[PDB]
RNA sequence: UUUAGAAGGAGAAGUCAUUUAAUAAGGCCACUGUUAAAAAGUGUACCGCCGGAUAGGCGG
């Protein structure tokens, strides 16, 4: 072994399909939907001044991390890498970073801006028909990653299992009650616009009602990283990412060797051992995909 | 000047300018016109580069410490925890900016008003570009409780250390 | 070497453009900074009407002097470019426009923004 | 020890023959310019002194035009009033002329104690009054101070090229110049420089009665150019004088 | 201090007349485009009052 070779990529371990708002009175929730729709003119939506809660529908698809490797030019390379999997595996089952991921379920976090203020977030998982008990997501803070949770357990485990190969798939799909006020302003994704003359702000449609993008929902659930080498002087996680960059701070918290580049480099060619807090951060970007091929 | 430091924490996937809009400056006010405007407000890691930045840092401002500590602030922002930070300490300090209310706002269409109460084009112009100098500074969202009327209060900073408050804790 | 022989072309990409406005005379500029917003198309429409062909390669551009922005601020009497404006070539230095009070207007950041933007796209930058 | 560069000086009618040339003025023409500005600083003891010179060719225009057979046809004015005996009447005698427009920087290295901004400026202001090879200075873009080869604007540098004179084949001279231009059509024959026809003395009729004198041929030589982003030792391109016994020969060492 | 120093190139003008470019033709065979992205930026203001006020200040 001796460089990242001329191509290397993985595809996403942890599918998200995008999002479709739904709109439901709160009392009786479980029984009844409208579709959101979107009002023109720049575009707003808002719930009908008479329901008083939102609903979003998204599906997860976790994939055997082992098996995501699209592709790899070196054949001695990927070798080492599977094996690097396996020992990680033996180390843990990849446990830590499921549970990570489904506190980033329970937490609520994937809604963004729609978090904020509500009175109630309720959230529940569905996996192969059978339905979890619903998160009392206020309970959770976003600075915290909760241990011990047995719903939280159970998911991370069936999750866990999945990234280790011991299953094919895992469909998960999500289910969230968020109440608010008769006509608040609800907040979809915005498009983007390629320097049209109108410049003027454009929601997401998915299927004719409001949606927000995979994109969105993804980069909310990878925001599990607090192993960086500072978070002493910051305590908040970040979405993972290959220089641990952000898009609210504009200082990288991981350029030079704690970036992924460099940790890869170490453990794969130079056959460096390194602690287990980055090796986490290493199957987390893993995880994630990307394309890791020679500069 | 004793003062009480309130941050907004940073990586919560909302920008810090709507957590002043929406949740810290209208329980400010409302403690302000609560406590007889007492208080001032300053923000510390305000720079203006080519637009107005407040940064996600608010220290409440006050002549008295027993007055300041009345407010509580604490057990006010309670629901907002999850991304509102309060530090527990109050602090004198010899360092402080104050900020004032712009003098002018938006001549513009105040002026449009005032002719509907009552443009000729030199006149409509150079409002406007007073205007948009205004539109450069620092602005908090704000809907009047007593009136309903939404607006932007444009913010600048000043040297000057004393003085009587606003409703808004701004200098006047 | 025959190819350093002057010609016409290199004569040509050794003299500049200039806009045909004059900021003194246009109703809706004063103190040369563009006080109305009415003007915009025709200040787009001059940038574009100059530019069409007239690209110049980055080493034989006109090198954007501070000389030039201070003697343009002189001219109206500013010591500094005001709060909230930015001084705008009415023909791109990339394009054939001199760096020259008579090419210079001064615009709004979002004017400034928005005729950018236009020129950019019709240019293809 | 220090370099200055005059940036895209244009000339206008540079005196472009010479005896067995025309086209690019002699070197010594450059050099005697580099000299005479020498004198003019020193004369307002600026004190500076011009120990080489480099000559970088930008653009060039011989006064004249193409015949359909591709040969140039020289330019002249019409001639005033030329001194001796038959100077009174109107039409006046056409001599051997020709002349060049360059657009040429000049690369100076210099010795002095205050070699900086303010000898730039006084380069500024004394160039005005001065020639290159009879030429009019009209224009100029700046003068600076440089550091490195990477200052100087892409251009083409003219240098000496004795080698491929010598290594011709060895006929004659006239004949190593006429088949080593034959062989390396990018090579230019140059004047360089005089040999003394007569022994050091004074005679009649001197421009100064009081500095020594000779009479001289010229001497040629080739020469070739480089492009200034291929040169690697600055010292490859700064001309400077030398005597030899009745030899007066710029050259580059 | 430079093959130094100096220069008015000038006036005027019918290019015209005429014309068959045609005849003929296999472009074909094979193929993995591919992994990964917060659209942000509070987009934005409002309605009155004092002031002859275009000037210049105000509350919410």
């Given at each position: 072994?001796?460089?990242?070779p001329?191509?290397l990529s993985?595809?996403r ?8 708002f739904?709109?439901t009175?709160?009392?009786k929730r ?6 959101l ?18 609903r979003i529908?998204?599906?997860?698809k976790?994939?055997?991390?082992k098996?995501s490797?699209?592709?790899c030019?070196?054949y ?14 033996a ?7 499921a549970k990570?991921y489904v506190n980033n379920?329970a ?11 509500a ?7 569905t996996?192969?028909?059978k ?14 990653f909760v241990?011990d949770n047995?719903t ?10 999945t990234?280790?190969?011991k299953?094919?798939?895992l469909?998960?799909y999500?289910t969230c009650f ?8 609800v ?8 320097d049209?003359?109108?410049?003027g ?12 993008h995979?994109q969105?929902?993804?980069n ?6 607090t ?9 908040f ?24 580049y460099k ?12 602690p287990i807090?980055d ?5 987390a ?6 394309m890791f091929?020679?500069? | 000047?004793?003062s009480?430091?309130?941050?907004i ?14 949740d810290?400056?209208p329980?400010l ?13 300053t923000?510390?890691?305000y ?9 996600n840092?608010?220290?409440v ?9 009345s ?9 907002v925890?999850?991304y ?9 300090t010899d360092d402080y900016?104050?900020?004032?209310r712009?003098?002018?706002?938006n001549?513009?269409?105040?002026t ?12 409509e112009?150079?409002?406007k570009?007073?205007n948009?100098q205004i539109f450069c500074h620092?602005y908090?969202?704000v809907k009047?409780?007593?009136?309903g ?18 409703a808004?804790?701004?200098?006047r | ?10 004569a040509l990409?050794?003299?500049?453009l ?16 563009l006080?109305?917003?009415?003007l915009l198309?025709?200040?787009?429409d ?7 062909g007239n690209?110049?390669?980055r ?6 002097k501070?000389?030039?922005?201070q ?13 909230g404006?930015?001084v ?14 008579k090419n210079m ?6 004017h400034?923004?928005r005729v950018?933007?236009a020129?950019?796209?019709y240019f293809?930058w | ?9 244009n000339?206008?009618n540079?005196?472009?023959?010479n005896?067995?040339?025309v086209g690019?003025?002699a070197?010594t ?21 011009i ?21 140039y ?8 009033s030329?001194?001796?005996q038959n100077?009174?009447?109107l039409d006046?005698?056409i001599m ?12 100076l290295?210099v ?6 901004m ?9 160039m005005?009054?001065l020639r290159i090879?009879?030429?009019i200075?009209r224009?100029?873009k700046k ?9 100087i ?8 090229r004795?080698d ?9 001279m006239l004949?190593k110049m006429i088949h080593a231009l034959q ?7 140059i004047?360089?420089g005089?040999?003394?026809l ?6 009649e ?8 004198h ?17 040169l690697?030792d600055?010292?490859s391109?700064?001309?400077r004088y030398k ?6 020969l710029?050259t580059i060492?």
């Amino acid at each position: 072994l001796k460089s990242r070779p001329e191509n290397l990529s993985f595809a996403r371990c942890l599918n998200t399909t995008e999002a479709k708002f739904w709109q439901t009175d709160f009392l009786k929730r479980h029984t009844f939907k409208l579709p959101l729709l979107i009002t023109d003119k720049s575009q707003s939506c808002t719930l009908s001044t008479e329901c008083d809660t939102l609903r979003i529908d998204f599906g997860i698809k976790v994939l055997p991390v082992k098996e995501s490797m699209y592709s790899c030019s070196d054949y001695n390379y990927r070798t080492a890498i599977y094996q690097k999997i396996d020992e990680y595996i033996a180390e843990d089952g990849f446990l830590t970073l499921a549970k990570r991921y489904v506190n980033n379920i329970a937490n609520a976090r994937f809604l963004w801006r729609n978090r904020k203020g509500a009175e109630i977030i309720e959230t529940i998982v569905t996996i192969e028909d059978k339905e979890y008990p619903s998160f009392n997501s206020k309970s959770f803070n976003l600075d915290t990653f909760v241990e011990d949770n047995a719903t939280i357990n159970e998911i991370a485990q069936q999750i866990a299992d999945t990234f280790a190969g011991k299953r094919e798939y895992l469909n998960i799909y999500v289910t969230c009650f968020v109440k608010i006020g008769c006509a608040m302003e609800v907040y979809p994704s915005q498009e983007m616009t390629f320097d049209d003359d109108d410049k003027g702000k454009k929601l997401f449609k998915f299927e004719g009602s409001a949606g927000m993008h995979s994109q969105k929902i993804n980069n909310a659930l990878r925001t599990i990283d607090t192993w960086y080498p500072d978070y002493t002087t910051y305590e908040f996680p970040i979405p993972v990412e290959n220089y641990g960059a952000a898009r609210s701070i504009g200082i990288p918290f991981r350029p030079d060797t704690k970036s992924f580049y460099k940790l890869i480099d170490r453990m794969i060619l130079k056959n460096e051992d390194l602690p287990i807090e980055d090796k986490h951060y290493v199957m987390a970007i893993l995880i994630r995909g990307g394309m890791f091929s020679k500069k | 000047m004793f003062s009480q430091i309130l941050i907004i924490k940073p990586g919560t996937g909302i920008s810090p300018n709507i957590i002043i809009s929406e949740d810290i400056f209208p329980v400010l006010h409302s403690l302000f016109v609560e406590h007889d405007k007492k208080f001032g407000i300053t923000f510390p890691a305000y720079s203006f580069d080519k637009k107005g930045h407040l940064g996600n840092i608010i220290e409440v401002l006050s002549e008295d410490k027993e007055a300041l500590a009345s407010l509580c602030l604490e057990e006010h922002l309670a629901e907002v925890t999850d991304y509102v930070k309060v530090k527990k300490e109050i602090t004198f300090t010899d360092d402080y900016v104050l900020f004032k209310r712009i003098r002018e706002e938006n001549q513009y269409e105040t002026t449009a008003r005032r002719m509907r109460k009552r443009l000729g084009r030199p006149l409509e112009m150079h409002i406007k570009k007073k205007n948009q100098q205004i539109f450069c500074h620092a602005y908090i969202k704000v809907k009047s409780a007593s009136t309903g009327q939404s607006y932007n209060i444009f913010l600048a900073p000043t040297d000057i250390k004393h003085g009587s408050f606003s409703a808004y804790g701004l200098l006047r | 070497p025959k190819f350093l022989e002057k010609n016409l072309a290199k004569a040509l990409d050794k003299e500049y453009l200039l806009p045909d406005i004059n900021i003194d005379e246009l109703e809706g500029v004063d103190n040369g900074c563009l006080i109305d917003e009415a003007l915009l198309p025709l200040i787009i429409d001059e940038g574009k009407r100059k530019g069409e062909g007239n690209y110049r390669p980055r080493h034989l551009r006109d090198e954007r002097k501070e000389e030039t922005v201070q003697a343009f601020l002189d001219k109206y009497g500013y010591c500094n470019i005001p709060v909230g404006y930015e001084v705008h070539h009415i023909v791109p230095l990339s394009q054939g426009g001199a760096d020259s009070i008579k090419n210079m207007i001064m615009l709004s950041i979002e004017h400034h923004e928005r005729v950018t933007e236009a020129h950019a796209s019709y240019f293809k930058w | 020890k220090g370099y200055i560069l005059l940036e895209k000086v244009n000339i206008e009618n540079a005196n472009a023959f010479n005896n067995i040339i025309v086209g690019i003025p002699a070197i010594t023409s450059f050099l005697g310019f580099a000299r005479a500005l020498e004198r003019k600083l020193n004369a307002k003891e600026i004190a500076i002194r011009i120990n080489g010179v480099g000559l970088e060719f930008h653009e060039y225009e011989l006064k004249g035009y193409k015949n359909k057979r591709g040969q140039y046809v020289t330019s002249c004015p019409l001639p005033g009033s030329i001194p001796g005996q038959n100077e009174k009447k109107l039409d006046a005698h056409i001599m051997n002329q020709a002349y060049i427009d360059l657009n040429m920087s000049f690369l100076l290295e210099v010795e002095g104690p205050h070699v900086d901004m303010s000898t730039c400026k006084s380069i500024k202001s004394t160039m005005e009054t001065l020639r290159i090879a009879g030429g009019i200075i009209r224009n100029y873009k700046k003068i600076r101070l440089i550091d490195t080869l990477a200052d100087i604007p892409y251009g083409y540098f003219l240098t000496l090229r004795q080698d491929n004179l010598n290594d011709a084949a060895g006929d004659d001279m006239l004949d190593k110049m006429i088949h080593a231009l034959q062989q390396e059509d990018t090579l230019v024959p140059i004047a360089v420089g005089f040999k003394a026809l007569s022994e050091v003395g004074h005679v009649e009729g001197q421009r100064d009665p009081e500095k020594d004198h000779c009479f001289v041929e010229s001497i040629f030589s080739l020469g070739g150019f480089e492009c200034s982003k291929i040169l690697e030792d600055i010292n490859s391109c700064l001309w400077r004088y030398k005597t030899e016994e009745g030899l007066y020969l710029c050259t580059i060492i």
